[PDB]
Amino acid sequence: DRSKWHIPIPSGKNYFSFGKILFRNTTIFLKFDGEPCDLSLNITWYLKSADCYNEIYNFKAEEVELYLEKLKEKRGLSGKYQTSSKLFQNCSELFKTQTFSGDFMHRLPTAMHEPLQTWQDAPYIFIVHIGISSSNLFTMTVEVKGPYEYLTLEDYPLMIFFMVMCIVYVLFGVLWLAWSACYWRDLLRIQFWIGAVIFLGMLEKAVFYAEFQNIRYKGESVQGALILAELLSAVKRSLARTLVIIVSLGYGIVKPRLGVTLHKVVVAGALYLLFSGMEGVLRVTGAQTDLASLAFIPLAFLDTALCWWIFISLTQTMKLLKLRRNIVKLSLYRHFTNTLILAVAASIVFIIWTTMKFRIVTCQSDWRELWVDDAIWRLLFSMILFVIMVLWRPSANNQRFAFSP
Template identity: 25%
Template sequence: MYSRKAWGGEIDPFILTKFAKVEDDTAAQNNLVSLVIFEWGDESLIGRPVPGTDDELATICDPANIEANLCTQEELGAFILAENATEAAKSTILSKAVNLNDPAAINYPVKKTGFYCVSTFAYSGHDYQGVVEFRNSYGELPAAQIAKLPFYGALTIVYAVIGVFWAFLYVQNRHDILPVQNYITAILIFLVVEQAMTWGFYDYQNRHGMNAFAKVLMIIVAILNAGRNAFSFFLLLIVCMGYGVVKPTLGRTMLWVRLLAIAHFVFSVIYGIASLSITPESAGPLVLLVILPLAATLTAFYVWTLNSLNLTMKDLVERRQKTKAMMYRKLWWCILGSIIVIFGFFFINSFAFAGRSAINFVPDHWKTRWFVLDGWLNIVYLFDIAFVAYLWRPTANNRRFAMSDELAQDDDGFEIRSLANSLDEEGAIPLEENDYERHSLERELSPVPPKPVQPAPQQRESLDGETIFAVGEEDADKFSEDEDEDEDFRKSSEERRKLTGEPSL
């Protein structure tokens, strides 16, 4: 329970307890039910040690404990509190015996945030029924889930902002869009809708409680969550296969990837519905029929994705496609970082919780349990999808250059040789010893200076060096310059032949 100051609201939070009335001729004192309401931190203040014993604790006021001066006759049937309970308690401890012949509703006001408990005991030994309502000031959501309301609202805004930036780049470069960028566009739109629906479900439940329409919304959210997971695995797999950047099409492989995504979606929906309808007490061996198919498709996605990423990187490295290999290396580090964060988070939480007793786990972590189970996974997913969208963002000329190859080179330098040397090496006529001086003289008389070999044009990276899609335009007069150079070369060659006496071609 949260105090009114913690989350605000229109009413003061309270705990209301109401027992069902029992109609019989039994004496009133035989229809008593013991009731105590307290904050978990004050649990040690309930009960008193029995005199003459080592560790026996008296918790219910009965005639024997009255004789032992552990409680009074007016407290008969109620829980026994410690002598200093009033001063030492962090919150008020309510203890009383309720007469089921004429039970009145008991309202316990909550002044401080805490984990509050309601405990009852059948003092008379008869069956009884009762209802307990925990009412927070902000609405109907349980206190352990209220933090999800602003969390999913913030996620919706963040995904919407990412979608706006992506839409701006998409429209700006709409004539140069790759197929894989269309898939990223679809999943960003889907994520905004899915997060908005999740936020809407918690907001509706907070306003109206868990009624029939809220249950329908819960099923819709479960289906959307299953669709997000399947779509995300599908997108990551085709990206790791090099779709749109290394390969223009995946052929029949795309069909198998889609079938795997559809199977994962179906099994995720079945698992989501089963988790909502099956309680831990009623779960039996048949629950494996729900878990095993989902685990199989999830494992298939993981193995196929990592194997495809390794093969794509290996192919790019062998072809010396440095820019593209750099992109997939960054994606590999992103996936590895996500796995490390996930396992690291589990390890840290397991280590932190190992030293705590099981009975204290929920009372000590009820505020953060939602984040451990759900919140941090959504943050990791947000960073992953934002990173993939950044690397594969639409830019100018990305369609033209995405499928182009860099010039593979073994070293970073260029060999510069004269054209005359090249021509002499290509001549198949061996030199006689007495011809050595004549050829040396011819080279000295040659007026043509050595012409450096122009490096082959290479695919250029963008200004920020993050993606291969942002590539500048080629010079418009490239071919005209080449023609002028060829004409100068022919004139120089003709002059050289005249000086050396070689016949014209």
């Protein structure tokens, strides 16, 4: 999300709260700037740790004024916290009481810790309340800085994973270009679209890495990035699905390229991409407009129908091909169908494990590996793409996979 916040104090109830996972030994900086001052101020701040992620997930600021009393009777959730309050006559716009040269304030759950600092990597909730007693007047700048500049926890492993994915996709592109350049006398039209898929994946990974680098080094995310990356990912997935469907039917490999075969049938699968547009951009930009179930159900049903169609077409194509005594293409089709069935089994196992580990627990006691659900799918897609690349590689006699009328 963000690490730098600018807030006009005379707005609402003057409560500013945020809950997120933070590193150990991270500092929180508060600055105040604005017009000349004439009103008494009273600033109170709470910084609370979290035993499990649940209280950071269902934390709604709209009732935060109630939440404090839940933290006042010692009847809330377990976790140590620090509190402090200070009074200022007019504005105190040049003192650094919240910056340095403070004291050692004990935490309640004999601590003697630094005033405003994290003591262990964990989910933290920070709340600040300003009371003004005798139309913007001030401006509050809030920053968080740990061992890195602005890269909080839960984003470091994702950034490393995206870097590794960028390197892997660059290697894939280099290998494909080398193989293509080595054998250019006779290629296939199916061997040109795999380069397009690799290019789209490379662009998506580069966009993600650039966005993460900018958010780390500036503290503010780029608005038109995540949406573009999601759109590119959806386009790449739709292209891969349609290529697999067209290969499964034997269009151009077993049977001749009939006039209306892909027309009105294969192209109509492009609406799947539309559904892929309703779950990517919608999920990346938090809306919560009662569309999560509508974003997950039809995509799963469409994918199941596509898998059913692909398997039936593959069975029919293999049955037809075995009757004419063909051995070169039969082994390739058997390897292709084995890879597809293994991918389906791995995907179903992954989805069962993800649904049985994360969204079944009362509160997530293991929040460290909370990023795996956003990377296992990409890793599986990359592995399947590499296997398909190894299966369909240009060679000396690159014509065994032709129709040959």
